[PDB]
Amino acid sequence: EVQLLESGGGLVQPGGSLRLSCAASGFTFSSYAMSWVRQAPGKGLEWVSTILQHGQRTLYADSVKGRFTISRDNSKNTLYLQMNSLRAEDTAVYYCAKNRAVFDYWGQGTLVTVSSTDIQMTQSPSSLSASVGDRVTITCRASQSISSYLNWYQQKPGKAPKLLIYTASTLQSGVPSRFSGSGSGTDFTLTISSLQPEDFATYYCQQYRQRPPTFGQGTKVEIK
C-alpha cells in the first residue's frame, strides 16, 4: 500500500555530486518525518539523515555533516538528499525510510558508487545455517542501557528492509506470530519458532534511545 520509490543514484567520480529523490505515496507525507539510511557493501546499516515535519529541521550524521543536505517537497510528497563532495566511503545502497526513530516503511534502495560516541550494537551470530522448521535465536547487545527502545528489521537479499518488531517486543502489524522479540536494558533476543522457506534473510537490530539511532552489523540466516 505504502510506496517509497527512490531514484537519482548511480556512479560518480570522487568529489562529484548526486541528488537522491524518494517519492512517497500511501500516507500523509507532511505529517511524518523522513530519513535516509545507507548500507555500505558487506557492512551494516548506517543512519545518514532525517527531516522532521513542519519544522524544516534537519539532523545529519557526523560523517556526512556539511556535505549532505536533506530536504522535502510536501507538495510533491518527495524527499531529496543532495550529496556533495562525495568520498569513496560514501559508496553504499541508500534507502529512504519513514519516521525518525522506528522506520516502518523502507525504500528498495539505490546504489551509489564512487570510484575512479553513540551506542554500538553487536549481534550474535553474524551468520547461521538452519533448515526449515527450526527455531533460530539472534542476540542483540547494546553498549549501554537502551531500555526497551529496540527494533528488529528483516532484509531479504537485494530487497528493502522490513520492520519486524518495535519497542523490543511489540510485533509489527502484518508480521507472522512465529516471530518473537524479547529482552530489555542491554540484552535482546529475536526468536523464530518455526523457520519458513521465505524466512531466510538478514536480520538487523536498531536502537533509538540515543540519537543518532544505530544498527547492528546484521545476522544472516542461510540454508543448510
Author numbering: 3 to 118, 134 to 241
The authors write:
The M2 is a proton-selective ion channel, and it plays a pivotal role in the uncoating of the viral core during entry and viral assembly. M2 ectodomain (M2e) is a potential universal candidate for monoclonal antibody therapy owing to its conserved nature across influenza virus subtypes and its importance in viral propagation. We selected a 10-mer conserved epitope of the N-terminal region of the M2 ectodomain as SLLTEVETPI (labeled U1) used for screening against the Tomlinson (I + J) scFv phage libraries. Four distinct clones (AU1, GU1, JU1, and UU1) were obtained based on changes in the CDR regions.
To facilitate crystallization, an extended U1 peptide with five additional amino acids were used during the process to improve scFv-peptide complex crystals. The co-crystals of scFv AU1 with extended U1 peptide crystallized in the P212121 space group with five molecules of scFv in the asymmetric unit. Of the five scFv molecules, three are unliganded, and organized as one dimer and one monomer. The remaining two molecules exist as a dimer with a peptide dimer at scFv dimeric interface. Distinct CDR orientations in liganded scFvs allows accommodation of the peptide at scFv interface in the form of a wider groove with extensive scFv-peptide interactions. Interestingly the two peptide molecules are present in parallel dimer orientation at the interface of the two scFv molecules. They were stabilized by backbone hydrogen bonds providing a twisted parallel beta-sheet conformation to the peptide dimer. One molecule of scFv used interactions through the heavy chain, and another molecule of scFv used interactions through the light chain, making a stable complex with the peptide dimer. The residues Lys100 (CDR VH3), Arg102 (CDR VH3), and Tyr107 (CDR VH3) of scFv (monomer B) formed hydrogen bonds with both the peptide molecules. Thus, the two scFvs capture the peptide epitope in a dimeric parallel ß-sheet conformation perhaps trapping the entire membrane bound M2 protein in dimeric form with physiological consequences.
